[PDB]
Each structure stands twice: as C-alpha cells, then as structure tokens.
Amino acid sequence: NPNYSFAGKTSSISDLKEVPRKNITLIRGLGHGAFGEVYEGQVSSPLQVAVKTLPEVCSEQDELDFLMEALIISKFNHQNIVRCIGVSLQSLPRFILLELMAGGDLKSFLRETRPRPSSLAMLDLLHVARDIACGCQYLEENHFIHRDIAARNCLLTCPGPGRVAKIGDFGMARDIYRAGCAMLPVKWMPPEAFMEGIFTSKTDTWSFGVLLWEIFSLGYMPYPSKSNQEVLEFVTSGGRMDPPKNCPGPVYRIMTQCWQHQPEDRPNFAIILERIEYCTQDPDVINTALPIEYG
Numbered sequence: 001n002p003n004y005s006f007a008g009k010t011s012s013i014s015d016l017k018e019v020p021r022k023n024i025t026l027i028r029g030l031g032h033g034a035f036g037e038v039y040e041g042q043v044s045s046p047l048q049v050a051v052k053t054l055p056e057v058c059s060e061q062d063e064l065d066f067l068m069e070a071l072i073i074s075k076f077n078h079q080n081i082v083r084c085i086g087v088s089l090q091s092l093p094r095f096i097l098l099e100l101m102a103g104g105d106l107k108s109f110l111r112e113t114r115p116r117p118s119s120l121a122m123l124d125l126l127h128v129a130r131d132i133a134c135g136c137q138y139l140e141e142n143h144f145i146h147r148d149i150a151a152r153n154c155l156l157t158c159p160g161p162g163r164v165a166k167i168g169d170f171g172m173a174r175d176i177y178r179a180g181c182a183m184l185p186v187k188w189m190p191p192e193a194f195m196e197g198i199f200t201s202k203t204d205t206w207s208f209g210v211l212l213w214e215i216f217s218l219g220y221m222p223y224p225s226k227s228n229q230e231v232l233e234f235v236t237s238g239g240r241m242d243p244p245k246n247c248p249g250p251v252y253r254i255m256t257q258c259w260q261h262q263p264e265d266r267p268n269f270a271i272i273l274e275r276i277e278y279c280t281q282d283p284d285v286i287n288t289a290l291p292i293e294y295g
C-alpha cells in the first residue's frame with residue numbers, strides 16, 4: 001500500500017472508488033499508448049467511460065506504477081484535467097475508469113482537422129490553448145509538476161464545436177514520483193531540466209510554449225528535421241523555433257516568453273492565461289487565416 005500525497009493530503013489504494021467488475025462493460029478498443037490498450041466502456045442510461053487496462057502479464061513494478069497512476073488522477077479536481085470515475089483493481093485485468101474523451105488526442109486531432117479543400121480557425125486554437133493553460137495553472141497552484149506537457153498528452157471532449165481540451169496523461173510525473181535516455185521528452189524540456197535534472201513549475205511553462213507551437217503549427221513535430229541531441233545542443237546554445245506558418249505575432253511572443261533561458265524570466269500560468277485572453281480578444285489575431293493544406 002504505497003501512499004500518495006498531493007496538495008498536502010495523503011491517499012492510498014483504500015481511497016480509490018472501486019467499481020464492481022459486473023457493472024463494467026467494454027464496447028470497443030480506442031487504441032494504445034505504451035501502457036496497455038484503452039477501451040470505450042460503460043458503467044452501470046449507463047455512464048460512458050474510457051477504460052485503461054493493466055496487462056495481466058506484467059512486473060510487480062508495473063502493478064505499482066498503475067496503482068500510482070490511479071491515485072494521481074483521482075486526487076485532481078479540475079475541468080481541464082480528465083476525471084477519474086473510479087477503478088476496478090480487485091479483478092483481472094485491472095482497470096482505471098476515466099472520463100471518456102470522444103475527440104481523442106490533440107496531436108491527432110490537429111493533424112486530421114487541418115483546413116483543406118473552414119474546419120478550424122485561430123479562435124479554435126486559442127480556446128484549446130486557454131483550456132490547457134487553465135489545467136496547467138491548477139497544477140501550478142497545487143505545486144504539481146507535470147514534466148510532459150505535450151499535444152500527445154492532451155485530449156478533446158468531442159471533435160466538433162464546443163470541444164474542451166484537457167490534460168489526459170500523467171505517466172512521466174508517475175515515473176518520477178516512483179523513482180530511459182531515449183524516451184525522455186527532450187524536445188519539450190528546458191535547459192536546466194535536461195542538464196541538471198532540476199524541475200519546477202517554470203519547467204511546465206517551457207513545455208507549454210512547445211505545446212503552443214504544436215497547436216499553431218496544426219500538429220507538426222517540434223524542431224523539424226532535428227534529432228533529440230541536435231535539439232538539446234540547439235536549445236542549450238540559445239536556439240529557438242521559428243513561428244509556425246501564419247502564426248500571429250502576439251501568439252508567437254507567448255512562445256518566446258515561455259522559452260526564456262532563465263526560469264525566472266518565464267511567465268507563470270496566470271500571466272500566460274492573460275496573454276492568451278488578450279490574443280483572443282484581438283481582431284487582428286483572430287481574423288488571421290490558417291494555411292490550407294493541399295488535398
């Protein structure tokens with residue numbers, strides 16, 4: 001029974017809301033991460049959920065990783081962080097039950113919803129950014145360092161208008177709480193993080209800058225044509241990404257403030273939200289056309 005502490009309150013497996021296995025039905029696979037497979041499920045107007053599964057063939061450490069993931073997500077309480085409905089850890093395979101996000105991951109969304117021969121506008125992108133910044137502000141307020149803010153780790157409620165973006169994966173924070181080189185999110189990390197292994201909330205500010213780039217580029221990989229080591233040396237020597245195609249100046253300037261070399265010179269998330277809000281109200285920003293991808 002490992003204990004988990006967040007916002008000064010401690011929790012253990014006993015605090016998790018166990019849902020009887022017979023109340024849970026799987027409908028379809030939704031895809032996989034590195035972390036087993038994810039299904040759409042229903043809990044008994046049944047409740048629609050996402051079901052994250054633990055492989056039955058796994059190590060004792062995978063078991064503990066999965067428990068810790070459950071405790072981490074269960075203690076958050078915020079509209080831009082996916083809810084945990086409960087868990088079913090007393091039958092096999094073990095389940096974590098999460099808010100179903102019918103729009104899928106943000107990176108995939110951006111790539112698949114690129115304007116082609118009116119799907120997205122600048123304001124859609126700014127709303128996604130606001131939503132994630134709101135989730136990041138909540139983490140910062142509660143002294144939680146995420147360590148992997150990236151489009152692949154964000155989810156959307158629905159594909160269409162009204163979509164809300166939320167932070168959906170806490171795997172890196174989980175690994176560090178419980179503590180390879182080639183798996184580190186180098187391209188989202190600030191100098192002091194990959195050099196000294198020093199993480200603070202100004203670490204997540206930097207990563208959020210990179211997420212902003214991903215959003216306004218409509219889902220491109222950061223630092224096009226650069227490998228991890230090339231990015232590490234580029235960033236460490238003061239190198240910064242160029243603006244995404246058609247990116248308004250005021251939105252680019254949020255990215256460049258997020259990427260200040262010294263953590264002290266980076267904005268906190270209250271300031272980032274203020275700047276996103278200003279961009280959102282500015283006609284010259286929101287009237288900028290996104291590029292149309294030829295097809």
Ligand SMILES: C=CCNS(=O)(=O)c1cccc(C(=O)Nc2nc3cc(CN4CCCCC4)ccc3n2[C@H]2CC[C@@H](CO)CC2)c1
Pocket residue numbers: 030031032033038050052082098099100101102103104105152153154155159168169
């Ligand atoms: C962001 C990482 C996933 N973290 S999670 O597995 O703990 C999680 C938590 C809460 C919800 C979800 C979830 O709903 N995932 C999910 N829903 C998907 C829906 C679709 C349907 N598409 C139809 C066409 C329009 C776009 C949506 C597709 C994939 C969906 N996923 C994925 C997210 C990425 C991976 C994560 O393992 C698989 C599950 C996933």
